[PDB]
Amino acid sequence: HMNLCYIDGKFLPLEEAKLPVTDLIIQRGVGVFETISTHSRRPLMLTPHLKRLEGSATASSIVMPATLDEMARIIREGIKKMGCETMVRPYITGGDSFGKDHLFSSSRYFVIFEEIRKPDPILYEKGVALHPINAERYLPSTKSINYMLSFTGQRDSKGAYEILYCPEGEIVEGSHSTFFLIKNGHLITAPTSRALSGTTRQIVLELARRGNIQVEERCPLLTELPEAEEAFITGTVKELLPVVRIGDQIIGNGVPGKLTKHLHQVYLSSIVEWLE
Amino acid sequence: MNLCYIDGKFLPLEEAKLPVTDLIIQRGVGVFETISTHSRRPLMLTPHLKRLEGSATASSIVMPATLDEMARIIREGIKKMGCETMVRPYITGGDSFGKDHLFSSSRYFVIFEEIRKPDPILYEKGVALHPINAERYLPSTKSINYMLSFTGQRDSKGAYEILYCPEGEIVEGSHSTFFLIKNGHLITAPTSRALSGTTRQIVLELARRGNIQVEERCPLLTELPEAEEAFITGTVKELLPVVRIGDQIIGNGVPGKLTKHLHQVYLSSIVEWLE
Numbered sequence: 314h315m316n317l318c319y320i321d322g323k324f325l326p327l328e329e330a331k332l333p334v335t336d337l338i339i340q341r342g343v344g345v346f347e348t349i350s351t352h353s354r355r356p357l358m359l360t361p362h363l364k365r366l367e368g369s370a371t372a373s374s375i376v377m378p379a380t381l382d383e384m385a386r387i388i389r390e391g392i393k394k395m396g397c398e399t400m401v402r403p404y405i406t407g408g409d410s411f412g413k414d415h416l417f418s419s420s421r422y423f424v425i426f427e428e429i430r431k432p433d434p435i436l437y438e439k440g441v442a443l444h445p446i447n448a449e450r451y452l453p454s455t456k457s458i459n460y461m462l463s464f465t466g467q468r469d470s471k472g473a474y475e476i477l478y479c480p481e482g483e484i485v486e487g488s489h490s491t492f493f494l495i496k497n498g499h500l501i502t503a504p505t506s507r508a509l510s511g512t513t514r515q516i517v518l519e520l521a522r523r524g525n526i527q528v529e530e531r532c533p534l535l536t537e538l539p540e541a542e543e544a545f546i547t548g549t550v551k552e553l554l555p556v557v558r559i560g561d562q563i564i565g566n567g568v569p570g571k572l573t574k575h576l577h578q579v580y581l582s583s584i585v586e587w588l589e
Numbered sequence: 590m591n592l593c594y595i596d597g598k599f600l601p602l603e604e605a606k607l608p609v610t611d612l613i614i615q616r617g618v619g620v621f622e623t624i625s626t627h628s629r630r631p632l633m634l635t636p637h638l639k640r641l642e643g644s645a646t647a648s649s650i651v652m653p654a655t656l657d658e659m660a661r662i663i664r665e666g667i668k669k670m671g672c673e674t675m676v677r678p679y680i681t682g683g684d685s686f687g688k689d690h691l692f693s694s695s696r697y698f699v700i701f702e703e704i705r706k707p708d709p710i711l712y713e714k715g716v717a718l719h720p721i722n723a724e725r726y727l728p729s730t731k732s733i734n735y736m737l738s739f740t741g742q743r744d745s746k747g748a749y750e751i752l753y754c755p756e757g758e759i760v761e762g763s764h765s766t767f768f769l770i771k772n773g774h775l776i777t778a779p780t781s782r783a784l785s786g787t788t789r790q791i792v793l794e795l796a797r798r799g800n801i802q803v804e805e806r807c808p809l810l811t812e813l814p815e816a817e818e819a820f821i822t823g824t825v826k827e828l829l830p831v832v833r834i835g836d837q838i839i840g841n842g843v844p845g846k847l848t849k850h851l852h853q854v855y856l857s858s859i860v861e862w863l864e
């Protein structure tokens with residue numbers, strides 16, 4: 314199906330939807346969003362995503378322009394119209410003004426609906442490279458629209474798949490992904506005091522609980538990578554994507570590892586539990 | 590009325606729209622400049638447009654128009670406004686990042702608004718800043734990312750502006766160059782750390798003319814109790830006195846004599862840089 318945008322009460326073809334230049338998302342980068350994906354055309358972790366969207370807006374002093382029930386109504390209606398596997402992005406804008414009450418009270422919203430684009434199967438076979446940077450995401454619980462560092466930082470990337478935020482040599486997360494390290498057959502991942510509360514992350518920790526795999530919620534260190542067996546990044550579109558290189562450092566023997574492939578299989582076998 | 594130049598026309602500002610496909614909207618990929626007028630002439634027009642090109646190039650965005658063309662639009666829009674104007678040319682990422690790692694379908698538009706100077710009372714009383722432990726990444730680049738300038742005013746205590754103070758080193762304001770005055774000297778962060786402000790560049794020339802010493806280092810939050818004065822600079826706000834940073838009063842909590850002197854010399858001198 315054609316890509317859609319829900320804006321001003323209607324589903325438009327995506328390429329026709331426009332936003333007023335007065336909006337502070339355009340002028341000043343004031344915006345939050347979510348990415349929601351489907352399996353068998355059903356939305357995965359819809360409620361957790363919409364609660365995260367509200368968290369992002371409230372933490373950003375943005376007054377929600379619609380109820381979560383209303384956003385869920387729109388998202389379901391658009392997925393039905395797409396009739397295929399879909400990546401859905403609801404956006405909440407700052408709107409035209411920051412009031413004397415220090416809130417954005419005229420927020421706009423729109424929802425993008427696109428045919429899903431999974432990473433190429435070769436990337437799951439070979440794994441990917443990450444480019445570490447000495448930077449952090451501010452207000453890391455908040456998912457804002459600001460991804461400019463993910464792009465401008467590709468000059469020095471050496472064709473890395475994704476940037477990895479490594480402030481002072483402590484690995485937190487990717488620009489689009491949760492990061493997991495594997496040492497001694499268990500999982501190391503940054504705490505959500507420092508990293509986004511990923512929906513895929515939440516599911517992987519539940520799968521680890523079910524499988525009696527130990528999870529340490531601490532920032533893995535760049536200096537620990539020589540001793541690691543495996544690594545992977547997570548997100549709703551990419552699922553579990555093996556990581557075989559970070560900077561100049563090969564992870565383990567430089568191919569996807571057995572615990573990564575195991576968790577990926579259990580994820581896909583289990584996924585129906587979290588569809589809405 | 591306020592205007593936006595977009596797709597070859599001056600529109601009423603409130604009617605101009607941008608495709609939601611644009612990565613400025615989806616991913617915050619955008620750069621811009623703020624240019625202000627005195628006597629209907631843009632101040633430091635060429636320095637601003639050189640900064641805009643620098644921002645775009647540093648961000649892998651291919652210029653969608655020449656600087657001469659942007660200068661032409663800006664002058665025509667100032668003439669159409671018929672008042673003192675704040676002008677903001679924007680350059681967007683456009684719809685795609687190519688295999689060549691460039692934004693090659695950049696869009697652009699130019700906002701013209703009647704200027705809004707800080708109220709005269711703010712120059713008389715000075716303003717408060719809210720310090721935060723954060724930095725602007727790629728600080729020479731002026732991107733559209735000002736989200737922290739707002740969201741970081743949660744516990745602001747009614748501060749005028751946030752001040753980037755990473756690890757207690759003062760760099761700059763969210764919209765401003767920061768200057769500390771100590772022993773009759775100016776202290777301001779080097780351009781390795783802070784935006785190369787146009788107002789900043791003029792104030793350093795005014796310091797040279799007045800034999801006022803400038804130290805290009807980050808003032809520390811711990812130095813503030815020994816400071817005499819502070820001010821912030823930008824093309825709209827000129828020199829705006831700072832009398833409080835966080836809980837710390839600056840000097841005796843009113844605008845200082847060197848700030849008021851430099852502001853007077855600035856107003857007398859800026860004709861030199863009107864274009």
Ligand SMILES: Cc1ncc(COP(=O)(O)O)c(C/N=C(\CCC(=O)O)C(=O)O)c1O
Nearest residue numbers: 348489490491509511512513548549550551
């Ligand atoms: C900063 C950050 N960390 C982690 C994640 C992963 O969270 P979740 O597992 O809930 O998707 C995302 C989502 N990144 C996406 C899309 C998801 C994907 O990467 O597949 C984004 O919306 O940009 C993210 O933007």
Ligand SMILES: Cc1ncc(COP(=O)(O)O)c(C/N=C(\CCC(=O)O)C(=O)O)c1O
Nearest residue numbers: 623764765766784786787788823824825826
């Ligand atoms: C991060 C930052 N630093 C410094 C400056 C001061 O530069 P200049 O002296 O060239 O104006 C600005 C301008 N910020 C503005 C306008 C503020 C003003 O005009 O007073 C802005 O649009 O955000 C800025 O955004």
